[PDB]
Amino acid sequence: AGCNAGQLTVCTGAIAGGARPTAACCSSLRAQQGCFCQFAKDPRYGRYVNSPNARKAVSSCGIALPTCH
Numbered sequence: 502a503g504c505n506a507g508q509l510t511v512c513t514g515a516i517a518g519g520a521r522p523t524a525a526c527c528s529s530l531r532a533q534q535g536c537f538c539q540f541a542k543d544p545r546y547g548r549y550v551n552s553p554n555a556r557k558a559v560s561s562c563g564i565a566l567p568t569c570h
Contacts, residue, residue, distance in 0.1 A: 502544035504536030515562040518554025523562060530564035538569025 503509075505516070512530060514520035520527070530537065540546050551559075559566050 502542075503540035503546055504533075505540045505546070506549070508533060508536075509540070512562060515558075515560030515566065516550050516555045518556075518558030518560075520560050520562050527562040527564045530562060530567050534564055534567035534569075537565075537567035541568030541570055 505512070508526075508530065509516060512520065512523045512526040514523040515527075540550065543550075
C-alpha cells in the first residue's frame with residue numbers, strides 16, 4: 502500500500518487538515534509523487550488517509566494529494 506506511511510508522516514498536515522510545515526514536504530512529494538499513485542489505489546489508505554481530517558481537508562499540498570488520479 503501507498504508510500505505515505507513513510508513519506509506522508511511528515512506531510513500528514515495535508516491529509517490531516519493542517520499542512521503548514523509540510524509546505525517543503527509538498528515539493529518533496531512532487532519529487533516522488535509516483536509512489537503516491539499507490540496511495541491512490543486506496544488499498545489501506547482509506548482507513549488512514551481518510552479519516553480524520555482528509556474528510557474536510559484532503560488538502561491540496563498541491564503535489565496534489567498525489568493520488569495517481
